[PDB]
C-alpha cells in the first residue's frame, strides 16, 4: 500500500557502501613494516652478516639497533665463521626501506619499529662512503618523506638546474643569519611576534588609562626554584629595553645604595638581559612598542597582565646551536635563431593516444581538442577530426593555429584534451609550455601522459590545470610532434624587445588621419576619460572587462601609469597575440610604479602567467610585504607557485629566502609544502623546494624531524583504530590507545617536541590520563601534554591539541584564515568584533591538527546540561541561564557585550563566506561569553552544485536562544536597543569587508591552485560577489544585506 507493491529487485542487505557508519574517507598508508601497521611486540629479524651467515634474532619491536647489534655479535659467536667478523664496532646496519631504498642506519639509537623497513631484516656492513656527515641527507629525506637520492637519479635538466642554482638563495640567507651573531641567530630562530602597525585602535587605547599597562617582570636567582614578581606600570609604547631597566631598577633599589650608585648598577646589568614571555618560547628581541608585540596586545584585550621573564642573553645564546650550513655533494647553439625570424604559423602534429578507457557501446567517436593559451586563449580553438574512434585511436594530423610564430608570448602554453561525442565530454587532459625554462621554443616529438577530469570541470579543455605530463604512467598517453626550424628557436632578449617596443611607439606617432577603431591608439586626454579610468581601477577582479574598456584602457596605457593599481586590468586588456602590443607592455612594467601587496598578489594568480608581470609582482612583495603580512598570506603564496611555468623562478627564490631568514615563516612554509607532498601535481616541485629549505634551515631540521616523527606515529596509531579496531567498544579502543602510547617508541616519539600548530609552544610529557579518543567516527585523538616551560604555571600547565586522521582540513584552514583576516580588517579599522579563529593545520592527505579551546561548549552541551529531568523540551533561555551562572556581577554586562560583539562578526563572516549551515552542535560559547563557530564544512556554498542558483543563503540564523542572550533576557528581543546596536555592528562589519572585497576575491583566486573541490574555478569564487553585492552601490548592498538577513530571520531588520 505504501510502495504500490513495487519490488526493487537489485537491492540487497547481506552487506549489499560507507554510508552505513558514514565517516572516515581517506586511505591508505602502511606503517611500521610492509603490509602491516604496527609491528608485532616480539618479532624475528634476519641479520645478514659480512661472513654470509643469516642468524635470525627474535627482537622486541621496540628495541634499539645498539641492542640488536650488541646481541647479534654475541649470537654470531654461536654460528660458524666467527673469526671472519670484525669487532662489532667496525659495522653499521643496512636494509631496504618502504620508500624502496637501501638505507644505511647510522643513528643506532633508532628502534626497530621506527626504521620503516618493508621486510624485517638487517644487513651488516662496514660504513661505505666515509662522509658519515653527508649521508645525513636521510634527515632531509625523512623530513620531506621521500629520499634525497630519488632526485639525484632524475634525468630532466630543469630539475637539476633548479637544485644547483637555488643554493644561490640558500647561501645568501645563511649569510644574513651569522651577520651580527649570536644576536642575529636568535633573531632568525625567535623572531619578534609583532602586529604590523604600532598605532593602536581606539578600543584598545581606552583599556589602559592614557596608555599605561601593569606588567609583571619575573626573575630567577638561586638555585632556580624561587622567582620574584616585579610589577611595573610602564607605557604601552615603551620598548623592551626600557622595560628591562625599570625591572632591574626596582629589583636593585636598596637602602645600601645611593641613586648615583643605582644608575651605574642599572647600566652594567641592563643589556645583559632580554625579555621572554612566561610559558612559551617567544621573546622581545627588538625596538618595538611593547603594544606592537602580539602577546601584549592580546593581554590588553583579554583583560590580562603580561607575564614576561627577564632572561640572560647568555643563557639564551646557550640554547642556540650553530647553523653549520654546507654546499651539498651536487656542487647554447651558436646564438640560436630568434623566434621573430621564424616565418610561419603555429602547427602541432597530433599522433596517437594509447591508453584510452571508453565503452565502445556508450561513446560513438572521440577526438583531440587543442588550443593555445595565456590563462585565456590567443586564437580560435581547434580540434582534430573524429578519426579511428575508440578502438585504438590515432590521427596523424597537423593542426593549424592561426597565430604567427613571432606573436607567441613567452608564457604561451598548448592545452589539449581527448573528448567524447552534442554528446561533448572530456576523457583526459594535459597542457604543455610552448617554450621551456631555457627560453627555447618547443620542437620535435613530445610524449604527454594525461590527467583525469576532476569533479567540477564539465568544460572541454582546462588550461588553469597544471602544466606538464602526469607522472602516473598507466594513464592516457597522447604523444605528438612540433615543427622544427633547422635551429633551436629562442625567445627574444629584453634588449631586443626594448628596441621593437621603441620602434612600435615611434611608428604610431606617424599613423595618420582618421584611424577608426581608434580602439588601440591624443597626448592630451579628456577629463571624462580620466574619470572612466579610475572608475575601472576600483572594480574587483571578477568584474570582467568589455572589449571597449580593454581597447580604451590599452590606448591610454601611458596615462594608466599615473594610476598604478589599474595594472591588473591593463594587463588583461593587452592582445597577448600581438608581440607589438606585448613588447610595449614589457617596457611599461619595467618601470611601472610598485603597488600594495594586497593588489600585487592578484598578479601571481593563473590570469597573469607572463614572467615579466610576475617579476613586478614579486618586486612589490620585496618592497612592501612585511614578515608579518607574508606569514599571514603564506598559504596563498605557496599555492600560487603551482601557476608558475618553471621550477626556478623569482617567487620561489623570494619565499625560500624568507623561509631561511625567519624561522616562524620557515616553519609553516615547511608544513604547507609538506602538507601537499602526496599530491603528484606538485610532489616534484615541492620536494625540490623542501630539500633546499631543509638543507639550509640550520638546526630547525632536527626540530622538524621530531614533529614529523610524532605526526607519523599518530597517523599510524589512528590508521589502526580506524580499521580492525572499528566495530569495537570505545572501552576496547581506549585500552588499545593507552597501551600503545605507553610503549617506549611512542613515549620517545610523542613527547619532547614542538607544536606544529605553533612551534613556540613546547610539548613535553604525555599526560595519558587526559589523552583519549573522541566520540566522532573519524576517531580523532584528544592529546594532552605538559608545558615544560619554567613558567608553565603562568600561561598554561597543559597544552592539548586534537589530531584528526580522516578529514580534509584545508577548507577549514582557509575559512579560519579568512575569518582571522576579517577580524584584523575590522579591529585595526577601529571596530571590535571578536572572532576566535582557532588554530588548524593540515599536515597531509586529510590529516591535521586543531587547537583546543578550553572551557567552551557546543550549544547542545549547554542545553543537555541545562535540560530538565523529565525529557520534555529544551529551554531557549538555558543558554542565557548557563551564561549567567558563569558571569555574575559587573562581569555579566561585559560578557553580553562579548557574546554580542562575537555573534555579530560571526554572523557577517558566515553570511559572506556562505559556510555550511550552523546549528546547535557546531556553534560554541565560552565561559566568558564569546561565541565562535567550528566545523565549517563547505565554504562558498558548495551544496549549490546540486540545485543552488541565486540562493544567497543565511547560514547563521539567530534563533531565540541567541536573541534572548543579546537582549539581557527581555521578551520580544527583536525590538530592544541591545539589538539595535547589534544590527549596527552587523552592518558596519559587512561594509568593512565589502570595501576590502578585492583581497578576498584574490585570496580565493590564489587558492584555485589547491585541489579543493570548493575552489574549481572563478565562478565558484563569484558567490562572494553576490553576497558582498559588488555589482551594486553600497547603499543597495546595505539594503540587500538587510533584505537577506530579514527573510531568513522572519525578523525586523530595517
Amino acid at each position: 500500500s505504501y510502495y504500490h507493491h513495487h519490488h526493487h529487485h537489485d537491492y540487497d542487505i547481506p552487506t549489499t557502501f560507507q554510508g552505513a557508519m558514514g565517516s572516515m574517507p581517506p586511505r591508505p598508508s602502511s606503517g611500521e613494516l610492509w603490509g602491516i601497521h604496527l609491528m608485532p611486540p616480539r618479532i624475528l629479524v634476519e641479520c645478514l652478516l659480512p661472513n654470509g651467515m643469516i642468524v635470525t634474532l627474535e627482537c622486541l619491536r621496540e628495541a634499539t639497533l645498539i641492542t640488536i647489534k650488541h646481541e647479534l655479535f654475541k649470537e654470531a659467536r654461536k654460528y660458524p665463521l666467527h673469526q671472519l667478523l670484525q669487532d662489532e664496532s667496525s659495522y653499521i646496519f643496512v636494509s631496504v626501506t618502504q620508500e624502496a631504498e637501501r638505507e644505511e642506519f647510522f643513528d643506532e639509537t633508532r628502534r626497530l619499529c621506527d626504521l620503516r623497513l618493508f621486510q624485517p631484516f638487517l644487513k651488516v656492513i662496514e660504513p661505505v662512503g666515509n662522509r658519515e656527515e653527508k649521508i645525513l641527507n636521510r634527515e632531509i629525506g625523512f623530513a620531506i618523506g621521500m629520499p634525497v637520492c630519488e632526485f639525484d637519479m632524475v634525468k630532466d635538466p630543469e630539475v637539476q638546474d633548479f637544485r644547483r642554482n637555488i643554493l644561490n638563495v640558500c647561501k645568501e640567507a645563511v649569510d644574513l643569519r651569522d651577520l651580527n651573531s649570536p644576536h642575529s641567530r636568535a633573531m632568525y630562530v625567535y623572531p619578534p611576534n609583532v602586529e604590523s602597525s604600532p598605532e593602536l585602535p581606539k578600543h584598545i587605547y581606552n583599556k589602559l588609562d592614557k596608555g599605561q599597562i601593569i606588567v609583571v617582570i619575573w626573575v630567577i636567582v638561586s638555585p632556580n626554584n624561587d622567582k620574584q614578581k616585579y610589577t611595573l606600570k610602564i607605557n604601552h609604547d615603551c620598548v623592551p629595553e626600557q622595560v628591562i631597566a625599570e625591572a632591574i631598577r626596582k629589583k636593585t633599589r636598596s637602602m645600601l645604595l645611593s641613586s648615583e650608585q643605582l644608575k651605574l648598577c642599572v647600566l652594567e646589568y641592563q643589556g645583559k638581559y632580554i625579555l621572554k614571555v612566561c610559558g612559551c618560547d617567544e621573546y622581545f628581541l627588538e625596538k618595538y612598542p611593547l603594544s606592537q608585540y602580539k602577546y601584549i596586545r592580546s593581554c590588553i584585550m583579554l583583560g590580562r597582565m603580561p607575564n614576561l621573564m627577564l632572561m640572560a642573553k647568555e643563557s639564551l645564546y646557550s640554547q642556540l646551536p650553530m647553523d653549520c650550513f654546507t654546499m651539498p655533494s651536487y656542487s647554447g647553439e651558436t646564438s640560436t635563431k630568434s623566434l621573430w625570424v621564424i616565418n610561419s604559423a603555429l602547427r602541432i602534429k597530433i599522433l596517437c593516444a594509447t591508453y584510452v578507457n571508453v565503452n565502445i557501446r556508450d561513446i560513438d567517436k572521440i577526438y583531440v581538442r587543442t588550443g593555445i593559451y595565456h590563462g585565456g586563449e590567443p586564437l580560435c580553438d581547434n580540434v582534430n577530426t573524429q578519426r579511428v574512434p575508440c578502438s585504438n585511436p590515432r590521427w596523424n594530423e597537423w593542426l593549424n593555429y592561426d597565430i604567427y610564430i613571432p606573436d607567441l608570448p613567452r608564457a604561451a602554453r598548448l592545452c589539449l584534451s581527448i573528448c567524447s561525442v552534442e554528446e561533448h565530454c572530456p576523457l583526459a587532459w594535459g597542457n604543455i609550455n610552448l617554450f621551456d625554462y631555457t627560453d627555447t621554443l618547443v620542437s620535435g616529438k613530445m610524449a604527454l601522459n594525461l590527467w583525469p577530469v576532476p569533479h567540477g570541470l564539465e568544460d572541454l579543455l582546462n588550461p588553469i590545470g597544471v602544466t606538464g605530463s602526469n607522472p602516473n604512467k598507466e594513464t592516457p598517453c597522447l604523444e605528438l610532434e612540433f615543427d622544427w626550424f633547422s635551429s633551436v628557436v629562442k625567445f627574444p632578449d629584453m634588449s631586443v624587445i626594448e628596441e621593437h617596443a621603441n620602434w612600435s611607439v615611434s611608428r604610431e606617432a606617424g599613423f595618420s588621419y582618421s584611424h577608426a577603431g581608434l580602439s588601440n591608439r591624443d597626448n592630451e586626454l579628456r577629463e571624462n576619460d580620466k574619470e572612466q579610468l579610475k572608475a575601472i581601477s576600483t572594480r574587483d577582479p571578477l568584474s570582467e572587462i568589455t572589449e571597449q574598456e580593454k581597447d580604451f584602457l590599452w590606448s591610454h596605457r601611458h596615462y594608466c601609469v599615473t594610476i598604478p593599481e589599474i595594472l591588473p586590468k591593463l594587463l588583461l586588456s593587452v592582445k597577448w597575440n600581438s608581440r607589438d602590443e606585448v613588447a610595449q607592455m614589457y617596457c611599461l612594467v619595467k618601470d611601472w610604479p610598485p603597488i600594495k601587496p594586497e593588489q600585487a598578489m592578484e598578479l601571481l594568480d593563473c590570469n597573469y602567467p607572463d614572467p615579466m608581470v610576475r617579476g613586478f609582482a614579486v618586486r612589490c612583495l620585496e618592497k612592501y610585504l612585511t614578515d608579518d603580512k607574508l606569514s599571514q598570506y603564506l598559504i596563498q603564496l605557496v599555492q600560487v607557485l603551482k601557476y608558475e611555468q618553471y621550477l626556478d623562478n623569482l617567487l620561489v627564490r623570494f619565499l625560500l629566502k624568507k623561509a631561511l631568514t625567519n624561522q616562524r615563516i620557515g616553519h609553516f612554509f615547511f608544513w604547507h609544502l609538506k602538507s601537499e607532498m602526496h599530491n603528484k601535481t606538485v610532489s616534484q616541485r615541492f620536494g625540490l623546494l623542501l630539500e633546499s629549505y631543509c638543507r639550509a634551515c640550520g638546526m630547525y631540521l632536527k626540530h622538524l624531524n621530531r614533529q614529523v616523527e610524532a605526526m607519523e606515529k599518530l597517523i599510524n596509531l589512528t590508521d589502526i583504530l580506524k580499521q580492525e579496531k572499528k566495530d569495537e567498544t570505545q572501552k576496547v579502543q581506549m585500552k588499545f590507545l593507552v597501551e600503545q602510547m605507553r610503549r617506549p617508541d611512542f613515549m620517545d616519539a610523542l613527547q619532547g617536541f614542538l607544536s606544529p600548530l605553533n612551534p613556540a609552544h613546547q610539548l613535553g610529557n604525555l599526560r595519558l590520563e587526559e589523552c583519549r579518543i573522541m566520540s566522532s567516527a573519524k576517531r580523532p585523538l584528544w592529546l594532552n601534554w605538559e608545558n615544560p616551560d619554567i613558567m608553565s604555571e603562568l600561561l598554561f600547565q597543559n597544552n592539548e591539541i586534537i589530531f584528526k586522521n580522516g578529514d580534509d582540513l584545508r577548507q577549514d584552514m582557509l575559512t579560519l584564515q579568512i575569518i582571522r583576516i576579517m577580524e584584523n580588517i575590522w579591529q585595526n579599522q577601529g571596530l571590535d568584533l571578536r572572532m576566535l579563529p582557532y588554530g588548524c593545520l593540515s599536515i597531509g592527505d586529510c590529516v591535521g591538527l586543531i587547537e583546543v579551546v578550553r572551557n567552551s561548549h557546543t550549544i547542545m552541551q549547554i542545553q543537555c546540561k541545562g535540560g530538565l529531568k523529565g525529557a520534555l523540551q529544551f529551554n531557549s533561555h538555558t543558554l542565557h541561564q548557563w551564561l549567567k551562572d558563569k558571569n555574575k556581577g559587573e562581569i555579566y554586562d561585559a560578557a553580553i557585550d562579548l557574546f554580542t560583539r562575537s555573534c555579530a562578526g560571526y554572523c557577517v563572516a558566515t553570511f559572506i563566506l556562505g559556510i555550511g549551515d550552523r546549528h546547535n552542535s557546531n556553534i560554541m560559547v565560552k565561559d566568558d561569553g564569546q561565541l565562535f563557530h567550528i566545523d565549517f564544512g563547505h565554504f562558498l556554498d558548495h551544496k549549490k552544485k546540486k540545485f543552488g542558483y541565486k540562493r544567497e543563503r543565511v547560514p547563521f540564523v539567530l534563533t531565540q536562544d541567541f536573541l534572548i542572550v543579546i537582549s539581557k533576557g527581555a521578551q520580544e528581543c527583536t525590538k530592544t536597543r541591545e539589538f539595535e546596536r547589534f544590527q549596527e555592528m552587523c552592518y558596519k562589519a559587512y561594509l568593512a569587508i565589502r570595501q576590502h572585497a578585492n583581497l578576498f576575491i584574490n585570496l580565493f583566486s590564489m587558492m584555485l591552485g589547491s585541489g579543493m573541490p570548493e575552489l574549481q574555478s572563478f565562478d565558484d569564487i563569484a558567490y562572494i560577489r553576490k553576497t558582498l553585492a559588488l555589482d551594486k552601490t553600497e547603499q543597495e548592498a546595505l539594503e540587500y544585506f538587510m533584505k537577506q538577513m530579514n527573510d531568513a530571520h522572519h525578523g525586523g531588520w530595517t
Binding site: P25, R27, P28, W34, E46, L48, P50, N51, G52, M53, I54, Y79, P80, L81, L84, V96, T97, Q98, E99, A100, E101, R102, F118, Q119, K123, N357, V358, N359, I363, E377, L379, C380, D381, S420, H424, C425, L427, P452, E458, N472, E474, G517, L518, N520, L542, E544, I545, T546, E547, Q548, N577, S578, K946, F947, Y949, K950, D1019, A1022, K1026, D1031
Partner: protein, 257 residues
Amino acid sequence: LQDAEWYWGSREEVNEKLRDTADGTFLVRDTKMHGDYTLTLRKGGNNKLIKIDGKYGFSDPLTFSSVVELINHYRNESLAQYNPKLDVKYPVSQVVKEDNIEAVGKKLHEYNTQFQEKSREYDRLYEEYTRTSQEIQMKRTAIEAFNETIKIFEEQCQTQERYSKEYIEKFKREGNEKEIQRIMHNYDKLKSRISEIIDSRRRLEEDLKKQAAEYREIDKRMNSIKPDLIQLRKTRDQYLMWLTQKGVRQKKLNEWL
C-alpha cells in the same frame, strides 16, 4: 525587445548559461551609469563582453535604432570590420512540451534525484580511481623494494660461497661434516628464503595487474557516467529555466530540489 529570445536583462548567471556552449554562442545583458546593455558573446570558448539620442551601438557606427537592430545584423556577419581581432559571428536562449507547471516541477525533483544519485556514483568512483592509483604505485614501489631485497639476499647466498668455500678447502679434515653441514644448513636456509621472497614478489605483481585491470574499469565507467551526467544536468537546467519564466517561485523550488 523584452522578449527578443536571446535578450534576458547579472555577470555570474550569464557565465552559467555560457558554460559549455561552443564557439559563437551569445546573449545580451543590462551600473547603468556605466553603459546601458551588454552583448556577452562566447568566442572560441571564453566570455567576450561588448558594451552598447536613440541609436544603439558599439562605438561610433551608431546607425542602428534598436537593441534588436544591432544583433540581427551581426548574426549574419562577423565582428571583424568593427574591431580588429574578432573573426567569429548560435543565438542560444523539449521538456515534453508540458504546460502543467506542477508536473513539470515533480520531474525537476525526479531528474535532480537521478542527477544527485548519479553525482555520488561519479564521486565514489573518483575516490576508487585515486585510491587505486595509490595502492598500485605502493605496490610498484614495493616491487622495487622486493627486487632490491632479493639482490641483497642473492648477493648474500653468493657472499657466503666465496668465504664458505674458502673455509671448506682450507683445513677440510678438521670438523669435516661437523662444520660443512652447518654451513650447508645456513646456506640451504638462505636460498629457500630467497625462494619464498621471489614468490612473495610474483604474487604482488599478479595482484598488480588485477588492480590495474579494475583501475581501467573505473575510468571506463567514469567516462560512460560523465556524458550522461552532463545531459542529465543540462535537462535539469532547462526544466528549471522553463519554470522560472512564467511564475517567479524561487522559494517553492527548494522542496523538489
